[PDB]
Amino acid sequence: LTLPGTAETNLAVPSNAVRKVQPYPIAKPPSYSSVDSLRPARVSRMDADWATIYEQVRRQVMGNAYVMEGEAPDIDVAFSQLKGGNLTVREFVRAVGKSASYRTRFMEAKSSYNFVLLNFKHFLGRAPTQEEVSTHIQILATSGLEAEIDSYIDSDEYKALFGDHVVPYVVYRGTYLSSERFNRMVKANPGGATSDKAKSNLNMIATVAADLPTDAIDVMRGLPSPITSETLAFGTAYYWAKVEKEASEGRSASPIGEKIGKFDHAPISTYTSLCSYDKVNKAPQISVTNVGSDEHSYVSVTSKYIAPDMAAAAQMLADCQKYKAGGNAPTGKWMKYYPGTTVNMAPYISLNDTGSDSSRTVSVTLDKVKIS
């Protein structure tokens, strides 16, 4: 809408008011990158026509959206200026991302954490780290949608990889800033016939990019690698590991079990009296409200709640270092074993009949709200 020549909008850096448009598209990154020779060639503004620039912007920025002809007129607004040269293809995907057709299939329907991971998949063509999420999740908290898409397009990572004339694509650069950052990019970017719309939870890179260890599974990276770079290893060897994974990646089998949350349970023969291993760690999940006379009351047996292994980490490591001075004055004993133990009567309250008392011995130590 703005001008027939516009390199940069919104005046974020000071040196874009004097910056020309790029007269030619930018070069490839200068490292070796053995994978990209098997890859198809990148599509730019000045080598290809508008039939395939629109398809690859749908194949990368829109994921695989299946935009119809009456669907997305906001993209048809933004595409009609790109064919007139009124904005570059760098600014065009800023107009695609800020549009509501990108919002009404990736922002409202996916989750809050998954919206950041799809933005690195579409705009930068990779998958972020945890520190890249934690700087991008605050823009969704304090500044909203429009400033968060400005963090990709006005970044220096975009302008060095694509510039103003190159459609976004999966850039294999060989020497990466992290060894995770290759194979988390590859896992985030599968090949053809995959979209983002069915996986309303993505749930697998949402927990590999969540904690900084637990790099993702090898068959989830041998799957979208290119060809004469996967073969003689995907006939039937890892192929059943790929199919088993695809029925788990599809329908979003939540990886509490095998990926993170890793608890050595006891064998089933060890208890056998608290039996029926479907039910073994189930508790009543009770909830009361007690407001007026329209407030419902809880109860819906809970699931097999696991020891969380970090609340047992803050507890028993940060504290309970009451590991100090345990000689406890060994009085030439005969405490007939276990020492100062009160009989501890504890009368169960005499509601006049059918209520009775039992006792039990225990070692007693005075508490820490007891000194004073």
Partner: protein, 164 residues
């Protein structure tokens, strides 16, 4: 536009390399096929007024309902608009027989046809009724050579497959 020449020099441009021996091999295909398609161009150019008079009314022979008032054919002059509306397609098939690719057909005749035929309420089935009447009337001894009628049919159904 989208021809066999500009397919193999846009793909060489996108890879950023010289015209290799693969790209020189497709242009050898043009020496064997221009002797099939260029006499299909001048057979079309020497008979173009006949094949729009003989075959533009075949849609009206099929669909006489649109000459009712209140429809896409109201008066005589919109039917005189219609033979101008269909010889452009026969000029574009003549433009694609001489190119060899399908280049002049897309951005001149197809790209945007779903927007102008819906909004101005033209039925696209009566378009391809006139195009498919031209398609099944090909024959070997009268019309053209035996190989030209393969390729002249092969551009007409591309207009059918894109409009439908």
């Amino acid at each position: 536009m989208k021809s066999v020449i500009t397919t193999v020099v846009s793909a060489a441009d996108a890879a950023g390399r010289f015209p290799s021996n693969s790209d020189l091999e497709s242009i050898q295909g043009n020496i064997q096929r221009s002797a099939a398609r260029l006499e299909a161009a001048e057979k079309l150019a020497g008979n173009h007024e006949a094949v729009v008079k003989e075959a533009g009314d075949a849609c009206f022979a099929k669909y006489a309902y649109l000459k009712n008032p209140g429809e896409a054919g109201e008066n005589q002059e919109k039917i005189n608009k219609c033979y101008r509306d269909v010889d452009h397609y026969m000029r574009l098939v003549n433009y694609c027989l001489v190119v060899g690719g399908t280049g002049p057909l897309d951005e001149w005749g197809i790209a945007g046809a779903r927007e102008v035929y819906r909004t101005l309420n033209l039925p696209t089935s009566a378009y391809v009724a006139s195009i498919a009447y031209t398609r099944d009337r090909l024959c070997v001894p009268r019309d053209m050579s035996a190989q030209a009628g393969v390729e002249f049919s092969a551009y007409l159904d591309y207009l059918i497959n894109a409009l439908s």
